[PDB]
Short mmCIF file of C-alpha atoms and ligand atoms in Angstrom, two decimals:
data_model
loop_
_atom_site.label_atom_id
_atom_site.label_comp_id
_atom_site.label_asym_id
_atom_site.label_seq_id
_atom_site.Cartn_x
_atom_site.Cartn_y
_atom_site.Cartn_z
CA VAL C 1 -27.88 -102.25 58.74
CA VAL C 2 -31.15 -101.60 60.58
CA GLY C 3 -32.81 -104.44 62.49
CA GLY C 4 -29.86 -106.77 62.12
CA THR C 5 -27.40 -108.42 64.48
CA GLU C 6 -23.64 -108.62 64.91
CA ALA C 7 -22.21 -111.04 62.37
CA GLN C 8 -19.83 -113.71 63.62
CA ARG C 9 -16.37 -112.30 63.03
CA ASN C 10 -14.97 -112.90 59.56
CA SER C 11 -18.08 -114.89 58.58
CA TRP C 12 -18.41 -112.75 55.44
CA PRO C 13 -14.73 -112.81 54.30
CA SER C 14 -15.36 -110.99 51.01
CA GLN C 15 -16.98 -107.97 52.71
CA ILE C 16 -14.69 -104.95 52.76
CA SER C 17 -14.78 -101.49 54.28
CA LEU C 18 -14.18 -98.60 51.88
CA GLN C 19 -12.76 -95.61 53.76
CA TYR C 20 -11.60 -92.11 52.82
CA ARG C 21 -8.76 -90.14 54.37
CA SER C 22 -10.18 -87.91 57.08
CA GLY C 23 -7.66 -85.62 58.75
CA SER C 24 -5.03 -87.82 60.38
CA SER C 25 -7.11 -90.98 60.14
CA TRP C 26 -9.60 -92.78 57.89
CA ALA C 27 -13.40 -92.80 57.83
CA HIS C 28 -15.63 -95.65 56.69
CA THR C 29 -18.07 -94.52 54.00
CA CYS C 30 -19.05 -97.69 52.15
CA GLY C 31 -18.97 -101.44 51.97
CA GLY C 32 -17.67 -103.46 49.05
CA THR C 33 -16.97 -106.98 47.85
CA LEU C 34 -13.48 -108.32 47.18
CA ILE C 35 -13.71 -110.02 43.77
CA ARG C 36 -10.01 -110.46 42.96
CA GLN C 37 -6.87 -110.20 45.08
CA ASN C 38 -6.49 -106.69 43.71
CA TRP C 39 -10.05 -105.72 42.71
CA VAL C 40 -13.03 -104.59 44.77
CA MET C 41 -16.63 -104.18 43.61
CA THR C 42 -18.64 -101.35 45.14
CA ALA C 43 -21.32 -98.81 44.22
CA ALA C 44 -20.46 -96.04 41.78
CA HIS C 45 -21.87 -93.35 44.08
CA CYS C 46 -19.41 -94.41 46.78
CA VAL C 47 -16.73 -92.82 44.64
CA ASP C 48 -18.65 -89.86 43.23
CA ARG C 49 -16.59 -87.74 45.62
CA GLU C 50 -12.98 -87.83 44.39
CA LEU C 51 -11.33 -88.45 47.76
CA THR C 52 -8.40 -90.60 48.86
CA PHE C 53 -9.70 -94.13 49.44
CA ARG C 54 -8.38 -97.28 51.06
CA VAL C 55 -9.89 -100.72 51.53
CA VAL C 56 -9.87 -102.80 54.67
CA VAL C 57 -10.23 -106.55 54.19
CA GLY C 58 -10.78 -108.98 57.06
CA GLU C 59 -12.42 -106.22 59.10
CA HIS C 60 -14.95 -106.72 61.90
CA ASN C 61 -14.73 -103.83 64.35
CA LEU C 62 -13.93 -100.52 62.67
CA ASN C 63 -12.43 -99.04 65.83
CA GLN C 64 -10.62 -102.01 67.36
CA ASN C 65 -7.67 -104.13 66.27
CA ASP C 66 -9.10 -107.54 65.36
CA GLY C 67 -5.78 -109.00 64.23
CA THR C 68 -7.30 -110.05 60.91
CA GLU C 69 -7.24 -106.81 58.93
CA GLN C 70 -5.18 -105.80 55.91
CA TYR C 71 -5.12 -102.20 54.72
CA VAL C 72 -4.59 -101.41 51.06
CA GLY C 73 -5.00 -98.19 49.14
CA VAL C 74 -7.31 -97.75 46.19
CA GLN C 75 -5.03 -97.05 43.24
CA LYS C 76 -7.35 -96.96 40.22
CA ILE C 77 -11.12 -96.57 39.90
CA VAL C 78 -13.38 -97.64 37.04
CA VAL C 79 -16.97 -96.41 37.21
CA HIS C 80 -19.63 -97.79 34.89
CA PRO C 81 -19.85 -95.40 31.90
CA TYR C 82 -23.64 -95.13 32.19
CA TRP C 83 -23.58 -94.17 35.86
CA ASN C 84 -25.16 -90.76 36.43
CA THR C 85 -24.70 -89.29 39.91
CA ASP C 86 -27.75 -87.12 39.24
CA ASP C 87 -30.02 -90.10 38.61
CA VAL C 88 -29.35 -93.11 40.84
CA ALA C 89 -32.75 -94.49 39.80
CA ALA C 90 -31.40 -94.91 36.26
CA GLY C 91 -29.14 -97.64 37.61
CA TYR C 92 -25.58 -98.59 36.65
CA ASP C 93 -24.56 -97.94 40.25
CA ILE C 94 -21.41 -100.03 40.17
CA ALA C 95 -17.68 -99.43 40.14
CA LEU C 96 -14.50 -101.47 40.41
CA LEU C 97 -11.52 -100.47 42.53
CA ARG C 98 -8.06 -101.73 41.64
CA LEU C 99 -5.99 -101.98 44.80
CA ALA C 100 -2.42 -100.67 45.15
CA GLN C 101 -1.26 -104.19 46.00
CA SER C 102 -2.82 -107.64 46.06
CA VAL C 103 -4.20 -108.58 49.46
CA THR C 104 -3.30 -111.94 51.00
CA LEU C 105 -6.08 -114.52 50.93
CA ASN C 106 -6.76 -116.47 54.12
CA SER C 107 -9.73 -117.46 56.30
CA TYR C 108 -10.58 -113.78 56.92
CA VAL C 109 -9.99 -112.56 53.37
CA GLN C 110 -11.75 -114.41 50.56
CA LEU C 111 -12.82 -113.63 47.01
CA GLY C 112 -16.52 -112.98 46.72
CA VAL C 113 -18.54 -115.53 44.81
CA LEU C 114 -20.63 -113.96 42.07
CA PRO C 115 -23.77 -115.32 40.39
CA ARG C 116 -23.76 -116.54 36.81
CA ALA C 117 -24.62 -113.87 34.24
CA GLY C 118 -28.29 -112.93 34.00
CA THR C 119 -29.54 -114.94 36.97
CA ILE C 120 -32.55 -113.36 38.65
CA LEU C 121 -33.87 -114.60 41.99
CA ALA C 122 -37.44 -115.66 42.65
CA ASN C 123 -39.54 -113.64 45.07
CA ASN C 124 -38.73 -114.14 48.76
CA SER C 125 -35.28 -115.60 48.09
CA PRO C 126 -33.16 -115.96 51.26
CA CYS C 127 -30.47 -113.28 51.46
CA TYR C 128 -28.49 -111.31 54.00
CA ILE C 129 -27.29 -107.74 53.80
CA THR C 130 -24.06 -107.00 55.67
CA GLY C 131 -22.27 -103.80 56.58
CA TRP C 132 -21.17 -101.20 59.12
CA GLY C 133 -23.92 -98.75 58.20
CA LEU C 134 -26.27 -97.06 60.67
CA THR C 135 -28.43 -99.40 62.74
CA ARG C 136 -31.12 -96.73 62.99
CA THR C 137 -32.12 -93.55 61.22
CA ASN C 138 -29.93 -90.67 62.46
CA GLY C 139 -27.72 -93.09 64.35
CA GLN C 140 -24.00 -93.68 63.96
CA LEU C 141 -22.10 -96.35 62.08
CA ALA C 142 -22.16 -99.81 63.57
CA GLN C 143 -18.82 -100.53 65.21
CA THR C 144 -19.03 -104.24 64.41
CA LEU C 145 -20.07 -105.81 61.11
CA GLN C 146 -23.83 -106.34 61.08
CA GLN C 147 -26.04 -108.67 59.09
CA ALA C 148 -29.78 -108.78 58.56
CA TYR C 149 -31.91 -111.33 56.78
CA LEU C 150 -33.43 -109.51 53.80
CA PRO C 151 -35.55 -111.71 51.53
CA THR C 152 -35.85 -110.49 47.95
CA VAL C 153 -38.89 -108.71 46.56
CA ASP C 154 -39.16 -109.60 42.87
CA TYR C 155 -39.36 -107.03 40.09
CA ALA C 156 -43.10 -107.51 39.56
CA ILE C 157 -43.82 -106.58 43.16
CA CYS C 158 -40.97 -104.11 43.64
CA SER C 159 -41.73 -102.09 40.51
CA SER C 160 -45.44 -101.99 41.33
CA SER C 161 -46.87 -98.55 42.11
CA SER C 162 -47.31 -99.54 45.77
CA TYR C 163 -43.57 -100.11 46.16
CA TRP C 164 -40.95 -98.36 44.03
CA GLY C 165 -42.83 -98.06 40.77
CA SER C 166 -40.64 -97.50 37.71
CA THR C 167 -37.88 -96.18 39.98
CA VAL C 168 -36.71 -99.79 40.31
CA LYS C 169 -35.27 -101.33 37.15
CA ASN C 170 -34.80 -104.96 36.12
CA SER C 171 -31.07 -104.28 36.54
CA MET C 172 -31.67 -104.03 40.29
CA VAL C 173 -32.54 -106.35 43.15
CA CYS C 174 -34.93 -105.35 45.92
CA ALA C 175 -34.87 -106.94 49.35
CA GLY C 176 -36.65 -106.33 52.62
CA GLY C 177 -39.18 -103.53 52.82
CA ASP C 178 -40.96 -104.80 55.93
CA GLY C 179 -40.36 -101.46 57.63
CA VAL C 180 -38.03 -102.95 60.23
CA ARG C 181 -34.95 -104.39 58.49
CA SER C 182 -32.91 -102.62 55.82
CA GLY C 183 -29.56 -101.24 54.81
CA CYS C 184 -28.78 -97.69 55.94
CA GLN C 185 -26.07 -95.07 55.43
CA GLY C 186 -22.68 -96.73 55.44
CA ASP C 187 -23.91 -99.93 53.79
CA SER C 188 -23.68 -98.67 50.19
CA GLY C 189 -21.42 -100.65 47.88
CA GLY C 190 -21.71 -103.64 50.16
CA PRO C 191 -23.08 -107.10 49.36
CA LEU C 192 -26.48 -108.75 49.45
CA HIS C 193 -25.54 -112.40 49.97
CA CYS C 194 -28.12 -114.87 48.72
CA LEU C 195 -28.08 -118.61 49.34
CA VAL C 196 -28.43 -120.63 46.13
CA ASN C 197 -27.70 -124.38 45.99
CA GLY C 198 -25.79 -124.39 49.26
CA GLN C 199 -23.57 -121.44 48.35
CA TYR C 200 -23.90 -117.76 49.26
CA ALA C 201 -23.25 -115.49 46.28
CA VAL C 202 -23.22 -111.71 46.10
CA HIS C 203 -26.29 -110.89 43.98
CA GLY C 204 -26.41 -107.23 44.90
CA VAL C 205 -24.43 -104.07 45.48
CA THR C 206 -26.21 -101.84 48.01
CA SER C 207 -27.47 -98.69 46.29
CA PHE C 208 -30.41 -96.84 47.85
CA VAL C 209 -33.46 -96.60 50.08
CA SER C 210 -36.45 -94.27 50.28
CA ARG C 211 -36.00 -90.55 50.83
CA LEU C 212 -38.37 -91.12 53.75
CA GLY C 213 -35.84 -93.25 55.58
CA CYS C 214 -33.84 -96.46 55.63
CA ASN C 215 -36.45 -98.87 56.98
CA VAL C 216 -39.72 -97.96 55.29
CA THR C 217 -42.58 -100.36 54.65
CA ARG C 218 -42.95 -101.16 50.96
CA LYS C 219 -39.66 -99.41 50.19
CA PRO C 220 -37.22 -102.33 50.25
CA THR C 221 -33.50 -101.66 50.10
CA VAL C 222 -32.40 -101.48 46.46
CA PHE C 223 -29.26 -103.09 45.08
CA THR C 224 -27.50 -103.06 41.74
CA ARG C 225 -28.00 -106.55 40.28
CA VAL C 226 -24.53 -108.04 40.05
CA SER C 227 -25.64 -110.67 37.53
CA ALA C 228 -26.45 -107.90 35.05
CA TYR C 229 -22.82 -106.74 35.02
CA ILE C 230 -20.77 -109.93 34.79
CA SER C 231 -19.45 -109.17 31.31
CA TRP C 232 -18.83 -105.55 32.34
CA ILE C 233 -16.78 -106.66 35.35
CA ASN C 234 -14.81 -109.13 33.25
CA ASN C 235 -14.19 -106.51 30.56
CA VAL C 236 -12.81 -104.10 33.16
CA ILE C 237 -10.57 -106.69 34.80
CA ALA C 238 -9.44 -108.02 31.41
CA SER C 239 -8.64 -104.48 30.23
CA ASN C 240 -6.23 -104.64 33.18
CA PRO D 1 -34.42 -92.08 46.73
CA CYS D 2 -31.45 -91.58 49.06
CA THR D 3 -28.11 -93.38 48.63
CA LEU D 4 -26.60 -95.43 51.46
CA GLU D 5 -23.09 -94.01 51.65
CA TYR D 6 -21.91 -92.45 54.92
CA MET D 7 -20.44 -89.04 54.24
CA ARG D 8 -19.99 -85.70 55.98
CA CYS D 9 -21.83 -82.65 54.68
CA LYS D 10 -22.43 -78.95 55.30
CA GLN D 11 -25.62 -78.47 53.27
CA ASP D 12 -28.30 -80.63 51.64
CA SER D 13 -26.82 -80.08 48.18
CA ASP D 14 -23.66 -81.84 49.42
CA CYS D 15 -25.71 -85.02 49.69
CA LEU D 16 -26.67 -87.30 46.81
CA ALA D 17 -30.11 -87.91 45.34
CA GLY D 18 -32.87 -87.06 47.79
CA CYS D 19 -30.66 -87.36 50.86
CA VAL D 20 -30.41 -84.37 53.17
CA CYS D 21 -27.64 -83.13 55.43
CA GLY D 22 -28.53 -83.95 59.03
CA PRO D 23 -27.78 -81.56 61.92
CA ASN D 24 -24.99 -83.95 62.90
CA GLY D 25 -23.16 -83.17 59.67
CA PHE D 26 -23.84 -86.40 57.78
CA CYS D 27 -26.07 -87.26 54.85
CA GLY D 28 -29.22 -89.29 55.40
CA1 CA V 1 -10.68 -103.75 63.32
#
């Protein structure tokens, strides 16, 4: 997250860290949202590489023991059938991860709240992106969970030629684009929390930014619109 | 576009979409 600030620890209890086995340890690669005690929602591209993955719930500092973490391996992976690694702009950047075991829910580990099917936010809706991604282009991962206020940019504006053009689809949510705040490498798969009627819900799954950089004016961070995949998520979980 | 996953790489083709492999060995 570029232009953000350290989140209060465990203030986003559904945020998870998706990591792959790296040598004798593990390396954070993406964010994710815990949606069931044994299911995590993330971006499809986060699992394009068939590596060994694990999820860390209740995490805050990736390199320090916070006393609130739980580590669970990713057992099964279900990627949206329409996802095409060669065309992220086509959309469908979403995948569900079934965990090896169910994590224990507490104050640090909570199920993410999702929006009702089909809900689309009005322009400039209040949201926050969270994650351990880079805080600057060419930088390193953030050690502590970061958050940045990223108001939405509606489809009409976001899909305009000045912004993303047709690259952005109605199945996506845009947010930010002021050239200062944005998601960055390491934030993919993570949530875009938006406040609606007193409750923060995960309306987006971090997907991409401009090829020109993370924080680029008129190139808001783009997220998969969670509300467009409610039935898909339920079908996958129900198929157990 | 360039995806926001943090991953090691050896060449630009190892990175997704329009992302390139930085001299530090990571996509961006
Ligand atoms: Ca920790």
